[PDB]
Design an enzyme around this catalytic site. Structure first.
Site, short mmCIF file in Angstrom:
data_model
loop_
_atom_site.label_atom_id
_atom_site.label_comp_id
_atom_site.label_asym_id
_atom_site.label_seq_id
_atom_site.Cartn_x
_atom_site.Cartn_y
_atom_site.Cartn_z
N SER A 154 4.12 3.16 7.93
CA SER A 154 3.75 2.15 6.96
C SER A 154 4.95 1.67 6.16
CB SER A 154 2.70 2.62 6.02
OG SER A 154 1.50 2.86 6.73
N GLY A 155 5.01 0.35 5.90
CA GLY A 155 6.11 -0.20 5.13
C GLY A 155 7.33 -0.55 5.97
N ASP A 190 0.03 -7.53 2.01
CA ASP A 190 0.54 -6.15 1.97
C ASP A 190 2.07 -6.12 2.06
OD1 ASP A 190 0.67 -3.44 1.85
OD2 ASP A 190 -0.10 -3.00 3.87
N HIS A 241 0.81 -1.21 0.00
CA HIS A 241 0.00 0.00 0.00
C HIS A 241 0.85 1.28 0.00
CE1 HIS A 241 0.26 0.37 4.54
NE2 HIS A 241 0.06 1.66 4.25
#
Ligand SMILES: [Ca+2]
Length: 223
Positions: free
Chosen positions: A177-178, A84, A40
Site C-alpha cells: 500500500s502507498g 487515496d 489510507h
C-alpha cells in the site's frame, strides 16, 4: 507482492519504506523533499526510509528522514478509497544519487495494456502470510476500465484503475500500500486496494495519479 520477483538492490531508487517503528507502507520519492503515498497509509510519527533493499538490515545506502508534515488529499473518502493519495514532506532534503532518485510525475494518463512495474515489501502469499525482507517487483498491465468495473461493480471511480491478471496469482498486497506503479518512466498509480490478493477476477485497484498532478504541484509550491 504475490507472484513477483526480487527487484535487485536499489534498482527501484524512488521506492521508499514508511516506518512507524516497523515498515507499514510504501511510497514514491517525487523530489528531494516530497514523497507520494496512499491516504489510507496515514499515521503520525512517520520516518521515511530511502535507499532500502533489506528493510531489516542496515546495508549502507539508506537515508532515514523524519516527516515534518503529512497532507491527505482534501477529498479522501476512507470508506470508498476515492482520492487515496497523500503527500509527505521530509524534515530535510534527501541526497539524490544512483541509489536514491526521484520518479517523474505524469503529464498524460496511462493507457490500458501498458505494462507497469509495481514494487513493495508487502505480503507474498495469497491465503497465508509471509513478508519479505528485500524489495519485491511485479510487472503488471493496466486493465480496461470496463473490465475493472466488471470486477468491482459499483465501486470504481474515475480516480482509480485496475492492473494485474484476472486469472489471479500475481498482485500487490497488504504492506505494498502507498507504493509505486510506474509505467513508461512515470508514476501513474499508487497501490490502493483490492479484494484479497492475487484472487481470480479480483485485480488490484490503484489510485490514478494523473488526476492529481495539479494538486501535487500546487501543494508542493506552498509547503
Ligand atoms: Ca536496509
Amino acid at each position: 507482492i504475490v507472484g513477483g520477483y526480487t527487484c535487485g538492490a536499489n534498482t527501484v531508487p524512488y521506492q521508499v519504506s514508511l516506518n512507524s517503528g516497523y515498515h507499514f507502507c510504501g511510497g514514491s520519492l517525487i523530489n528531494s523533499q516530497w514523497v507520494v503515498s496512499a491516504a489510507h497509509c496515514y499515521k503520525s510519527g512517520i520516518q521515511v526510509r530511502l535507499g532500502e533493499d533489506n528493510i531489516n538490515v542496515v546495508e549502507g545506502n539508506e537515508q532515514f528522514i523524519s516527516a515534518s508534515k503529512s497532507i491527505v488529499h482534501p477529498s479522501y473518502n476512507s470508506n470508498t478509497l476515492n482520492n487515496d493519495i497523500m503527500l509527505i514532506k521530509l524534515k530535510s532534503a534527501a541526497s539524490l544519487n544512483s541509489r536514491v532518485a526521484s520518479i517523474s510525475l505524469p503529464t498524460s494518463c496511462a493507457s490500458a495494456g501498458t505494462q507497469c512495474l509495481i514494487s513493495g515489501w508487502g505480503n507474498t502469499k495469497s491465503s497465508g502470510t509471509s513478508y519479505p525482507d528485500v524489495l519485491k517487483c511485479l510487472k503488471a498491465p493496466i486493465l480496461s476500465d470496463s473490465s475493472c468495473k466488471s470486477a468491482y461493480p459499483g465501486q470504481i471511480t474515475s480516480n482509480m484503475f485496475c492492473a494485474g491478471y484476472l486469472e489471479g496469482g500475481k498482485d500487490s498486497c497488504q504492506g505494498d500500500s502507498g507504493g509505486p506503479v510506474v509505467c513508461s518512466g512515470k508514476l501513474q498509480g499508487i497501490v490502493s486496494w483490492g479484494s484479497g490478493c492475487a484472487q481470480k477476477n479480483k485485480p488490484g485497484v490503484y489510485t490514478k495519479v494523473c488526476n492529481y498532478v495539479s494538486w501535487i504541484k500546487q501543494t508542493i509550491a506552498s509547503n
